[PDB]
């Protein structure tokens, strides 16, 4: 899960899936409903 730092949850969900997001880091938006890194 270490896209920016190691994260312990499901990742690499559909690329174009964060128009708006919680924004865990610089890039990933963590949309849940997991399914982070987008």
């Amino acid at each position: 899960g270490c896209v920016l730092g190691l994260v312990n949850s499901s990742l690499f969900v559909e690329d174009c899936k964060l128009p708006l997001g919680q924004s865990l880091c610089a890039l990933p938006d963590t949309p849940s409903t997991m399914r982070l890194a987008s």
């Binding site: 270490c2 896209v3 730092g5 610089a26």
Partner: protein, 41 residues
């Protein structure tokens, strides 16, 4: 943005291919020590 963006007007604001030459040079001449995320540890 096209490489010959403004014909008679030389523009160094284009992307070398994303951080145009002037942006890169500006970040170079400053002294910053950012930790590589994924690697700082």
């Amino acid at each position: 943005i096209i490489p010959g963006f403004g014909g008679d007007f030389n523009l160094t604001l284009l992307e070398p291919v994303a951080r145009s030459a002037i942006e890169d040079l500006l970040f170079d001449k400053v002294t910053i020590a950012d930790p590589g995320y994924m690697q700082g540890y």
